[PDB]
Design a protein around this ligand. Structure first.
Ligand SMILES: N#CC[C@H](C1CCCC1)n1cc(-c2ncnc3[nH]ccc23)cn1
Length: 289
């Protein structure tokens, strides 16, 4: 129950898919003692986007986990237009930028620490029957050198009880190079498609976000930068159906790549669970230490 005349804009932190996040100071006493918080707002506040935003707020507020960004509250302007979501501010930004920043002091054990935390966050999501749908290092935030948190839930959906997937297609851009094949062909999203995307996240981490090694660059080279608009996705589909896959990143051990390729199974039922992913990653971590 923060109200916007005490929210002082400091800078933009991110621009999402119909929303953006600002770094602000909440200073109700107006003496510069208040906390720095993150404030998410819609950029073009239609009725559909606002109903989606309210569902997103309910989801985040229902999550309490060390590797999920903390909900703090909501902000309203006269009436209830201009809805704003108040969250904890995490000072090291997104894991994509952090990792690109500190390439030279983040070793493989540190990557596997982040990996384990992401899987525990995702397993908690699954226990709530939430499907994230936008798992990527740009949507993971760094609280400190030893803790990351899943940081955005704009595309997250609740499963119907009678079903284990959720069919949804949205207008606009979709992170198709993180999408499982059944999400590309049938718009089916499930815990298993989140596992596919987590494999892509793991690939990202072990590339250290090298520009020419991004999933989009690699896939566009594999189908050819000659492709064009939606013909593009069509070719992606066929490449994935013939087991075309992102390569093992430089310096990636063979067992970490084995985890990646196991998450990238065409057979939706043969992808590992998040509990098993965490177990294997933790055993590799223990071996390295
Ligand atoms: N995660 C993620 C991606 C997200 C952008 C994507 C969706 C709108 C903004 N983003 C969140 C932040 C951010 N930075 C620092 N503290 C935060 N708290 C909550 C979000 C947040 C920066 N970019």
């Amino acid at each position: 129950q923060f109200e916007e005349r005490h929210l002082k804009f400091l800078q933009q932190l991110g621009k999402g898919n119909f929303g953006s996040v600002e770094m602000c100071r909440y200073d109700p006493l107006q003496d510069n003692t208040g906390e720095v918080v993150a404030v998410k707002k819609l950029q073009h506040s239609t009725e559909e986007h606002l109903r989606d935003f309210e569902r997103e707020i309910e989801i985040l507020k229902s999550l309490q986990h060390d590797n999920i960004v903390k909900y703090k509250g909501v902000c309203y302007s006269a009436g209830r237009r201009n809805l704003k979501l108040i969250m904890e501010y995490l000072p090291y930004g997104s894991l994509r930028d952090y990792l690109q920043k500190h390439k030279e002091r983040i070793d493989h054990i540190k990557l596997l620490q982040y990996t384990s935390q992401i899987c525990k966050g995702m397993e908690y999501l699954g226990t709530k029957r939430y499907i994230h749908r936008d798992l990527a290092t740009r949507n993971i935030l760094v609280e400190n050198e030893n803790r990351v948190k899943i940081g955005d839930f704009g595309l997250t959906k609740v499963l119907p009880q009678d079903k284990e997937y959720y069919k949804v297609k949205e207008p606009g851009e979709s992170p198709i190079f993180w999408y499982a094949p059944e999400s590309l062909t049938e718009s089916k999203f499930s815990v298993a498609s989140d596992v596919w995307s987590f494999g892509v996240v793991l690939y990202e981490l072990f590339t250290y976000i090298e520009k020419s090694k991004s999933p989009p660059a690699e896939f566009m080279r594999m189908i050819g930068n000659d492709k064009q608009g939606q013909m593009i996705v069509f070719h992606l589909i066929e490449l994935l159906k013939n087991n075309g896959r992102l390569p093992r990143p430089d310096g990636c051990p063979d067992e970490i790549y084995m985890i990646m390729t196991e998450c990238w199974n065409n057979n939706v039922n043969q992808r590992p669970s998040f509990r098993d992913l965490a177990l294997r990653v933790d055993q590799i971590r223990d071996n390295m230490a």
